[PDB]
RNA sequence: UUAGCUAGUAGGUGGGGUAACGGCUCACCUAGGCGACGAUCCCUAGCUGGUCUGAGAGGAUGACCAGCCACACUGGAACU
RNA sequence: UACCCGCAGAAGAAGCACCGGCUAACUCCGUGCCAGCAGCCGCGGUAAUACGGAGGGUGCAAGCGUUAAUCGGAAUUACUGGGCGUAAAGCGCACGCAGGCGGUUUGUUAAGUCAGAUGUGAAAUCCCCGGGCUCAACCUGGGAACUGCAUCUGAUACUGG
């Protein structure tokens, strides 16, 4: 059902941007946040808050060019029916090093470029093309 | 398609 | 300073009254060698008159895409009917390797360095359609920062 | 493991000066340079994609005397070696031990240059290489041996180089009949016209 | 300190011996998915205290029968 | 028994030997059991091509590794020249 | 288009046994053991370090070299 | 024995396959869907560069062709990296065990994973820089590689309890 609430967040993201939608919303976690809030670091979105606190609500603020998509495509890569882990010297690059890879380790969730100042591995969580 | 149909019985190869 | 190659030939024919008329349909594709090209299609009576045709359309429908020293910024998916593109960027002085459709594209845009590998179908005009349309979203490190927005060392 | 036909119908099938002969006749004066040889040779032939690759891999194999069995071993160690593919297939082709003498003058043409390694006059730093497949190392001085330089090809060859242009990285002595192979050669000090990329593409499908 | 397995028991009939079932997550050598792998293994039970279902702790010893070569070290929890 | 002797490598008439410890119920190119060092009998002998080290040894002579005459001459000449 | 297999079989006591632990062997006692994570049956095959192919992942195989196991007309047994 | 001195004279030392396209090279005669050719496409009943021969050429080379076998091409058993409305394919439908998977908050365990380290992964082969045999093949020095497995100490975001 709703068994991958990330790649369920990362289908409220991929629609909104091509359907020129101002601003989103979905259902909030910690996990959640813990992925906006890099994205919100890393110029693809603009801005995220909370709302209600018995049913935790995010929402996004999209992010354009001329009307055109920010985020391009992003791509599921680890999922509940098949985990992928890399090490600390295995960390895939988007784009040749254009696009980041969001992993998410025991000092928090970082880049893979801010992985190497960090030397750790984990999961993979989307590719952000 | 699965990966997991794959762990019971993998492609049969000709 | 433009720079042509004829890529196919192939005759198509016309069911009449009378009997079969035929014809002749030709792809070109031109370029300056610095990141501009242009492909036409024709439909003519007769050969040099087919590839003329192509020619006159070559000049126009002609873009732009941002290179970086001869080569591609990133490996980009190409997607089309029946052509599965996936090209790849090299390391100075591999060579141009590709099928004979993809050649014709690739050097009229002065590209030297890339890997090239086109799956499922092998119709030479679906081919270089999505290799057009696979350069004009594939983007450049400058017009991504123009949205991220830092002029830090990913420039 | 050589070619014992014409030089210059190799020219006159690919229409390009290969330096088969020494310049003292011209190259249109023996030869319709732009006739293929044969039936046909005034009719021009269609070229195809296929062709621009084979067309300047024989261009260059004609000039050296590589066979292919060995020119593909040139192309074993071009892809092992780092850097440049085409800069390290010069490298191979220049770095021949009857190329340096050729470059150099004592030998006229390059067949007569392969037998003057091949028959014993050429001293590698005071010793003997008699085949003239041999990769020559930098810094190395290369001489006659003192029974081949009363020989008349060594006399009759040092005044035909030296109304050409002579390489950057070789230093000719003819009082002592001996040279220096000084350094490694780079693309732009060769020929220019010669595109290494349309070889290593028919090797690399 | 020394080699120490866990795992939980699937049969205890037999007088001063008991099966201990353990099992292990192994990245598939093709496609990387988390396959459980049952180990089953007969353990030496000194006094008969062990029953069904009961993650226990057990050591390595020397083969004490045809098929058994693992010895009993205490009951993590009994009968819950 | 554990013992000290050659191991007959290289092409055809070009004769070259490895120096390890074996067994001597193995053959020449038998299952020894670590490399110790090389020998080189067409080495021009104004570079390469000889060199062992004491300490490996020492630590198998002391265990008690019988030694052939071939390999001994190595270890009487070893002092001489170093 | 193989689903049930197995009574020295699974475990325990004691005796015996080999260089060593042990159903390795014997009497007695228990009725368990194995198995849809492939027991069992049938067919095929020496295996591995590797070679070859392939951008890689994979793929096919195991001659020469080296390591191990088995075998020495067929079958069985013991001595030294 | 390699090696080296000395002698005589180009004297002792080049062939095979192809030539319609794929795929490098074009004309001519003979034959007449007969003979033959051929890996594919399909050539030849009155003008065949495709048959047979000649002329000439091309690609290789002391080798050159053919047959058989393995992988690649083949993303044509698709993990990387395929599909299932009509091209081959969604069981006629439903219940449900085992199996797989699982919302959200906190604590704990550190199981999976990750970090570091030890031990190990025989040599040879492959790769990196060298050296040696006149050269190469070949032999060889050290390093890397062998992405493996076992143990200890760590970190706790995610997965598991
Ligand atoms: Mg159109
Ligand atoms: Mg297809
Ligand atoms: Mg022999
Ligand atoms: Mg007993
Ligand atoms: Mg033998
Ligand atoms: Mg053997
Ligand atoms: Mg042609
Ligand atoms: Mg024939
Ligand atoms: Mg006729
Ligand atoms: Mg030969
Ligand atoms: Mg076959
Ligand atoms: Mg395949
Ligand atoms: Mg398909
Ligand atoms: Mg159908
Ligand atoms: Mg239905
Ligand atoms: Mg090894
Ligand atoms: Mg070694
Ligand atoms: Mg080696
Ligand atoms: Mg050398």
Redesign the pocket.
Same mark, same amino acid.
């Given at each position: 059902?709703?068994? %991958?609430?990330?790649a369920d967040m990362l289908t409220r993201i991929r629609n909104g941007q091509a359907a020129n939608k101002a601003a989103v919303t979905m259902?909030?976690?910690?996990?959640?946040?813990?992925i906006a809030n890099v994205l919100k670091e890393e110029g693809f979105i603009e801005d995220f808050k909370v709302e209600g606190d018995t049913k935790?609500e995010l929402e996004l603020t999209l992010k354009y060019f001329q009307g055109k998509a920010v985020v391009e495509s992003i791509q599921r890569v680890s999922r509940?029916?098949?985990?992928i882990?890399?090490?600390? %010297?295995?960390l895939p690059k988007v784009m040749a090093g254009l696009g980041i890879a969001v992993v998410?380790?025991?000092? /928090?969730?970082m880049t893979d470029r801010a992985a190497r100042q960090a /030397?750790?591995? /984990?999961?993979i969580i989307c590719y952000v093309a | =398609?699965?990966?997991?149909?794959?762990?019971?019985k993998?492609? =049969?190869?000709? | 300073e433009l720079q042509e190659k004829l890529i196919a030939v192939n005759r198509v024919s016309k069911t009449v009254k009378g009997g079969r008329i035929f014809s002749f349909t030709a792809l070109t594709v031109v370029g300056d060698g610095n990141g501009r090209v242009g492909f036409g299609y024709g439909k003519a009576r007769e050969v040099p008159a087919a590839i003329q045709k192509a020619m006159e359309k070559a000049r126009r429908n002609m873009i732009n895409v941002a290179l970086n020293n001869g080569t591609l910024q990133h490996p980009v998916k190409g997607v089309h009917t029946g052509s599965?593109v996936?090209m790849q960027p090299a390391s100075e002085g591999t060579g141009i390797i590709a099928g004979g459709a993809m050649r014709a594209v690739l050097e009229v845009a002065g590209v030297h360095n890339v890997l090239a590998?086109?799956?499922?179908s092998?119709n030479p005009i679906n081919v270089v359609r999505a290799t057009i349309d696979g350069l004009e979203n594939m983007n450049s490190p400058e017009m991504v920062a123009a949205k991220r927005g830092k002029s830090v060392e990913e420039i | 493991?050589?070619?014992?036909?014409p030089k210059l119908?190799?020219s006159?099938?690919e229409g390009t000066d290969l330096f088969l002969k020494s310049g003292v006749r011209a190259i249109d004066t023996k030869c319709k340079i732009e006739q293929?040889?044969?039936?046909?040779g005034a009719?021009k032939?269609? &070229?195809?994609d296929?062709?621009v690759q084979?067309?300047e891999?024989?261009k260059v194999?004609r000039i050296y005397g590589v066979?292919?069995?060995?020119?593909? +071993?040139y192309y074993k160690?071009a892809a092992? &070696?780092?850097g440049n593919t085409g800069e390290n297939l010069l490298a191979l082709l220049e770095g021949r031990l009857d190329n340096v003498v050729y470059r150099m003058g004592f030998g006229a043409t390059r067949a007569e240059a392969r037998?003057l390694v091949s028959?014993?006059a050429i001293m590698?730093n005071g010793?003997?290489? +008699?085949?003239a *497949?041999?990769?020559v *190392?930098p810094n190395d001085v290369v001489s006659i041996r003192e029974?081949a330089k009363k020989q008349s090809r060594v006399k009759a060859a040092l005044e035909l180089a030296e109304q050409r242009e002579k390489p950057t990285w070789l230093e000719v002595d003819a009082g002592k009949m001996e040279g220096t192979f000084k350094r490694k050669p780079e693309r732009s000090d060769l020929s220019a016209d010669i595109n290494e990329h349309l070889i290593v593409e028919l090797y690399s499908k | #300190?020394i080699?120490?397995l866990q795992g939980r028991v699937? $049969?205890?009939?037999? @007088?001063? $011996?008991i099966?201990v079932a353990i @099992?292990?997550?192994v990245?598939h050598?093709?496609?990387?998915?988390?396959?459980?792998?049952?180990?089953?293994l007969?353990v030496?039970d000194e006094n008969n205290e062990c029953g069904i279902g009961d993650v226990v702790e057990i050591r390595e010893c020397?083969?004490? $029968?045809?098929? #058994?070569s693992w010895t009993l070290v205490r009951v993590v929890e009994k009968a819950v | 028994m554990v013992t000290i002797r050659l191991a007959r490598?290289?092409?055809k008439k070009?004769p070259?030997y490895?120096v390890?410890v074996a067994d001597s119920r193995?053959?020449?190119?038998?299952?020894?059991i670590?490399?110790v060092?090389?020998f080189?009998p067409?080495?021009?002998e104004k570079?390469?091509?000889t060199?062992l080290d004491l300490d490996r040894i020492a630590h198998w002579v002391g265990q008690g590794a019988t030694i052939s005459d071939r390999v001994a001459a190595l270890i009487k000449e070893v002092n001489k020249a170093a």
């Amino acid at each position: 059902s709703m068994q %991958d609430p990330i790649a369920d967040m990362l289908t409220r993201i991929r629609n909104g941007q091509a359907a020129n939608k101002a601003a989103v919303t979905m259902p909030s976690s910690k996990l959640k946040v813990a992925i906006a809030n890099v994205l919100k670091e890393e110029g693809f979105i603009e801005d995220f808050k909370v709302e209600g606190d018995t049913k935790p609500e995010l929402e996004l603020t999209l992010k354009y060019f001329q009307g055109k998509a920010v985020v391009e495509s992003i791509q599921r890569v680890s999922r509940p029916g098949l985990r992928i882990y890399k090490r600390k %010297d295995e960390l895939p690059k988007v784009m040749a090093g254009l696009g980041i890879a969001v992993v998410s380790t025991s000092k /928090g969730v970082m880049t893979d470029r801010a992985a190497r100042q960090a /030397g750790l591995g /984990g999961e993979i969580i989307c590719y952000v093309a | =398609a699965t990966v997991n149909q794959l762990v019971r019985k993998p492609r =049969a190869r000709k | 300073e433009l720079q042509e190659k004829l890529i196919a030939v192939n005759r198509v024919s016309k069911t009449v009254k009378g009997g079969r008329i035929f014809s002749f349909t030709a792809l070109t594709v031109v370029g300056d060698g610095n990141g501009r090209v242009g492909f036409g299609y024709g439909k003519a009576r007769e050969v040099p008159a087919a590839i003329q045709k192509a020619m006159e359309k070559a000049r126009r429908n002609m873009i732009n895409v941002a290179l970086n020293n001869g080569t591609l910024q990133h490996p980009v998916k190409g997607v089309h009917t029946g052509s599965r593109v996936f090209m790849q960027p090299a390391s100075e002085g591999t060579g141009i390797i590709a099928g004979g459709a993809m050649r014709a594209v690739l050097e009229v845009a002065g590209v030297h360095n890339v890997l090239a590998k086109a799956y499922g179908s092998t119709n030479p005009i679906n081919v270089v359609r999505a290799t057009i349309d696979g350069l004009e979203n594939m983007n450049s490190p400058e017009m991504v920062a123009a949205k991220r927005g830092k002029s830090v060392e990913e420039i | 493991a050589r070619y014992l036909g014409p030089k210059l119908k190799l020219s006159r099938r690919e229409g390009t000066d290969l330096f088969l002969k020494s310049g003292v006749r011209a190259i249109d004066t023996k030869c319709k340079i732009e006739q293929a040889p044969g039936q046909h040779g005034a009719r021009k032939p269609r &070229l195809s994609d296929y062709g621009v690759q084979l067309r300047e891999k024989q261009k260059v194999r004609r000039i050296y005397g590589v066979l292919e069995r060995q020119f593909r +071993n040139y192309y074993k160690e071009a892809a092992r &070696l780092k850097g440049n593919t085409g800069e390290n297939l010069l490298a191979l082709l220049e770095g021949r031990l009857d190329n340096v003498v050729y470059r150099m003058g004592f030998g006229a043409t390059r067949a007569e240059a392969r037998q003057l390694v091949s028959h014993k006059a050429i001293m590698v730093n005071g010793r003997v290489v +008699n085949i003239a *497949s041999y990769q020559v *190392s930098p810094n190395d001085v290369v001489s006659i041996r003192e029974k081949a330089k009363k020989q008349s090809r060594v006399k009759a060859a040092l005044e035909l180089a030296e109304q050409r242009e002579k390489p950057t990285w070789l230093e000719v002595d003819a009082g002592k009949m001996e040279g220096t192979f000084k350094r490694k050669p780079e693309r732009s000090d060769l020929s220019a016209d010669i595109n290494e990329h349309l070889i290593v593409e028919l090797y690399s499908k | #300190k020394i080699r120490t397995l866990q795992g939980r028991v699937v $049969s205890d009939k037999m @007088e001063k $011996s008991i099966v201990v079932a353990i @099992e292990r997550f192994v990245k598939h050598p093709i496609y990387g998915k988390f396959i459980k792998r049952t180990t089953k293994l007969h353990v030496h039970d000194e006094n008969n205290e062990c029953g069904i279902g009961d993650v226990v702790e057990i050591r390595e010893c020397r083969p004490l $029968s045809k098929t #058994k070569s693992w010895t009993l070290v205490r009951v993590v929890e009994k009968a819950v | 028994m554990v013992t000290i002797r050659l191991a007959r490598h290289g092409a055809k008439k070009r004769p070259f030997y490895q120096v390890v410890v074996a067994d001597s119920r193995n053959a020449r190119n038998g299952r020894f059991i670590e490399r110790v060092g090389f020998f080189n009998p067409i080495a021009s002998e104004k570079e390469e091509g000889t060199r062992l080290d004491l300490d490996r040894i020492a630590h198998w002579v002391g265990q008690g590794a019988t030694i052939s005459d071939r390999v001994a001459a190595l270890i009487k000449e070893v002092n001489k020249a170093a």
